[PDB]
Every structure is written in structure tokens, then in C-alpha cells.
Ligand binder design. Structure first.
Ligand SMILES: Nc1ncnc2c1ncn2[C@@H]1O[C@H](COP(=O)(O)OP(=O)(O)NP(=O)(O)O)[C@@H](O)[C@H]1O
Ligand SMILES: [Mg+2]
Length: 444
């Protein structure tokens, strides 16, 4: 058991991690910005350290301040949660070099999977199915680039190797646009890294992703999949597990290839392989080398506490859970709750004047918010996650509708009414909508 850890994050995930720590008897240190003194998890933590002012560069991305916090409190480990420094290989390195356990993968693994070109090469070698592509960086010889395009078959997509957040990529539908599309992506994505690659452009994929756990001692398991196709500006809005239409046989096929890839790259901890799924086929696009926001839907359908497993792995324990003990049962849906004007979709901070959480069988509310809590203007819009589990998908969705109606968040604007609309959407109710659906539905 880890004696004491620094929770190097904020909001709902910081509270998520604190709960897992409390369950396991692990002492907690909440590092926070000066704008986050009233966070629920900070108020519940055993120790707290204000690591700097509101701007993340001097708080949640402040590597020296976070490491000093660990030093002053005599912590043994640091959990980076998601976002912020979780996939910063320099942070991981410095954490370990400074004498602390980094609750995540090795820095080399973060680098390997953090660069898209190197990540694709490793997956291709490991036998994970990848999107047909250039399999390496593009030069500026445009006879050669037109040849790669022909081999792949248009339409293709130009992607920045250091790209992220839906930025640094251009869809190319023919030769005439190829030259300019490569040159501009090479500029627009100069993220500082000019390196671009070419992928086949999949025109109606679903987002299907595979959860893994690996102990970094040779054992790896997969915990089924999630469908996260309901997106806006490439940002996920609803997630569910398992993915509609995925058979046990298909699940086992892609699951086993991901688990094997973990062994090949010496992966350690929780991670997620993200695929575009189209015409019954999986195509690798990215590995998130950290816990994911939507991890709860997988927890609901497998019974596995993913955060507690992260902590056990970090403590140096081998996986106790064998693959044959992992069973998909029932179905779960997650609705992200955002402090945003639904129409303009940009953050809406302010004091919550009335709050009521939903309850009931299968209802799980993941949020730091409370009545009188002020949502600050500085950080991400997501203030909570509503997760509903049922014996089947219909029951999960029915419970989500019921839970969303009970959820009261007054004083700020939220996307609750939108989540109600998505739950009531006939195509969502059928299932299997693609990554373009929500924007088409809304008019975006
Ligand atoms: N080969 C492809 N075909 C179709 N769409 C793609 C392809 N590659 C990326 N995309 C789009 O880009 C989205 C995800 O990008 P996002 O995570 O916002 O930033 P990114 O990490 O730079 N790109 P990615 O590598 O796809 O995760 C996908 O959900 C697709 O909509
Ligand atoms: Mg990445």
C-alpha cells in the first residue's frame, strides 16, 4: 500500500482519486491553485498545499511546485489524473528522478505513444490494426506524396504528429488540394513540431476505444470497450459501455490485440486504445496513456475499480485480475455535465445557488460541486459526470433520463437540457450513431 500520495489535479477526477485513496487507507495531499481552495476534494483531503495562482502554468502544470509539495509532505507517489501533466513525459521523468512513484506509464512509453507517427509504428508492429497511411513522415516531394495518396486511396487526411484537440489536420479529397493541405498543416501545426503524416480518411466511423490495465511486469488485461461517438468539436459529450453492435467475438479479437500491444511496449498502469470503427473494422488512431474521463462506464459493466487498480500497480503489485474474471455485464451511459451556455458552448462560471443530485439504483454521480460552490472562470467547463447503469442499454438510458430530470444545478448555465435531448434522440435510442451525428443534429 502507498502511504501517501499527491493528487496532481482538480475537480471531479481529483475527488474520484481521493475516494479511491480513502478506501485503501492511503493518505492524501491535495495540491491546488489559489482559485481552488473550496474544491470538495481539497476540503476532504488529509493535507492541502496551495501550489500557486489560478493560471495553470504556475499551478497544475507547475512541475517544481508539485514535486516540492510531494517533498514537503513526504508523499511516496503522485497521481496526475487526466489532462494537465498526465501525458507529459518530462513530468513523469522528473517525478521518478526526484524519488516519487509516478502513477502512470514510464516516460519512454508516454513519448512513444505521445507522438502519433511513432505510436502508429509501434501499434503496426504489435499487430494492432491501424489506419492505412504513409507509415512515416511526409517530405515535400509532391510526386511521392501523390503516390502515397493513390496507394491509400482518396479521401485522405493530413495529420500533425504533435497534433491535438481537433487541431492540426486537413482532409484532402483529391490531388489538387494535396500540396497546399500538406504545407499549411505543416505550418499551422508549427505545436512547434512541423512533422505531418497521411492517413486514409474514414467518412462515417464510430469512436470505439479499448480500456486496458497492465502491471509493467508482463501482465495485461482489457476491460471491454466504450463508444464515445457523440461529440462536438471533437470533444466527447456522451460515452457508453459496451459499444452497441460489438459482439463478444469482435470484443475478444480487438481486446487481445490491445493487451498484447501493452506487453510489447512494456505498458504500465491504466490506458486506452482509441479506434475509429467502420464497416465492422477497427482502425487505431491514438493511445491515451492515462486514466480517461469516461472510465466510470467501464467500471459499472466490469465491477473493476480502475483508480484502485492504478494505485495497486503503482505500489508494484502484479495484476490479480485474470482476463477470465473480467465479464461484461449490463450497460452504462455517461453524460458529461458542463458549466457552459449550451448555445454558445463557451464556459459559464458563477455561484451555484441550488444543487440537487440524482439518486436510485444504478445511478452514479461524479462531481465536486455543491450548493454555494462557485465555479471559477479559469479551467475546463466540465463540472461533473452522470453515469447510469442498467441490466441492458434500454434500462441505462431510461435511468439516465430519470436522473437528468432530478439533477438541479441553478445559478449557472449547464448542458443538462441538451443531455436530455440526446437521451430522447431516436437515433441514439437505436444506437450506433457515428462521430458526426451530434453536430448534424444540432446544426454545427
Ligand atoms: N483517419 C481519420 N479519418 C476520419 N477522421 C479522423 C481520422 N483521424 C482523425 N480524425 C478525426 O479527428 C478526431 C479526433 O481528434 P482529436 O482527439 O480532437 O485531436 P488529435 O488527437 O489531434 N486527432 P486523433 O489522432 O484522431 O485523436 C476523430 O474523432 C476524427 O473526427
Ligand atoms: Mg496522446
Amino acid at each position: 500500500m502507498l502511504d501517501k500520495i499527491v493528487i496532481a489535479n482538480r475537480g471531479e477526477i481529483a475527488l474520484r482519486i481521493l475516494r479511491a485513496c480513502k478506501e485503501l487507507g492511503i493518505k492524501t495531499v491535495a495540491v491546488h491553485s489559489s482559485a481552488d481552495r473550496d474544491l470538495k476534494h481539497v476540503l476532504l483531503a488529509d493535507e492541502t498545499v496551495c501550489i500557486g495562482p489560478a493560471p495553470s502554468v504556475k499551478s497544475y502544470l507547475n512541475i517544481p511546485a508539485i514535486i516540492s509539495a510531494a517533498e514537503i509532505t513526504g508523499a511516496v507517489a503522485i497521481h496526475p489524473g487526466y489532462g494537465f501533466l498526465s501525458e507529459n513525459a518530462n513530468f513523469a521523468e522528473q517525478v521518478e528522478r526526484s524519488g516519487f512513484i509516478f502513477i502512470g506509464p514510464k516516460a519512454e512509453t508516454i513519448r512513444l505513444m505521445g507522438d502519433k507517427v511513432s505510436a502508429i509504428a509501434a501499434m503496426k508492429k504489435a499487430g494492432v490494426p491501424c489506419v492505412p497511411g504513409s507509415d512515416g513522415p511526409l517530405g515535400d516531394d509532391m510526386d511521392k506524396n501523390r503516390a502515397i495518396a493513390k496507394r491509400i486511396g482518396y479521401p485522405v487526411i493530413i495529420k500533425a504528429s504533435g497534433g491535438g484537440g481537433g487541431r492540426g489536420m486537413r482532409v484532402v479529397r483529391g490531388d489538387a488540394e494535396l500540396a497546399q493541405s500538406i504545407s499549411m498543416t505543416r505550418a499551422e501545426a508549427k505545436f512547434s513540431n512541423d512533422m505531418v503524416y497521411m492517413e486514409k480518411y474514414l467518412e462515417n466511423p464510430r469512436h470505439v476505444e479499448i480500456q486496458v490495465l497492465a502491471d509493467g511486469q508482463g501482465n495485461a488485461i482489457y476491460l471491454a470497450e466504450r463508444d464515445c461517438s457523440m461529440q462536438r468539436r471533437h470533444q466527447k459529450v456522451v460515452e457508453e459501455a459496451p459499444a452497441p453492435g460489438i459482439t463478444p467475438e469482435l470484443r475478444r479479437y480487438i481486446g487481445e490485440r490491445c493487451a498484447k500491444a501493452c506487453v510489447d511496449i512494456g505498458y504500465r498502469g491504466a490506458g486506452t486504445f482509441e479506434f475509429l470503427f467502420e464497416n465492422g473494422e477497427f482502425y487505431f488512431i491514438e493511445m491515451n496513456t492515462r486514466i480517461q474521463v469516461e472510465h466510470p462506464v467501464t467500471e459499472m459493466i466490469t465491477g473493476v475499480d480502475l483508480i484502485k487498480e492504478q494505485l495497486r500497480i503503482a505500489a508494484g503489485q502484479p495484476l490479480s485480475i485474470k482476463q477470465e474474471e473480467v465479464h461484461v455485464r449490463g450497460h452504462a451511459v455517461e453524460c458529461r455535465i458542463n458549466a457552459e451556455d449550451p448555445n454558445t458552448f463557451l464556459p459559464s462560471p458563477g455561484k451555484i445557488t441550488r444543487f440537487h443530485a440524482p439518486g436510485g439504483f444504478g445511478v452514479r454521480w461524479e462531481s465536486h460541486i455543491y450548493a454555494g460552490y462557485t465555479v471559477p472562470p479559469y479551467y475546463d467547463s466540465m463540472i461533473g459526470k452522470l453515469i447510469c447503469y442498467g441490466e441492458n442499454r434500454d434500462v441505462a438510458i431510461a435511468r439516465m433520463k430519470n436522473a437528468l430530470q432530478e439533477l438541479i444545478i441553478d445559478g449557472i448555465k449547464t448542458n443538462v437540457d441538451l443531455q436530455i435531448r440526446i437521451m430522447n434522440d431516436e437515433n441514439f435510442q437505436h444506437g450506433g450513431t457515428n462521430i458526426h451525428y451530434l453536430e448534424k443534429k444540432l446544426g454545427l
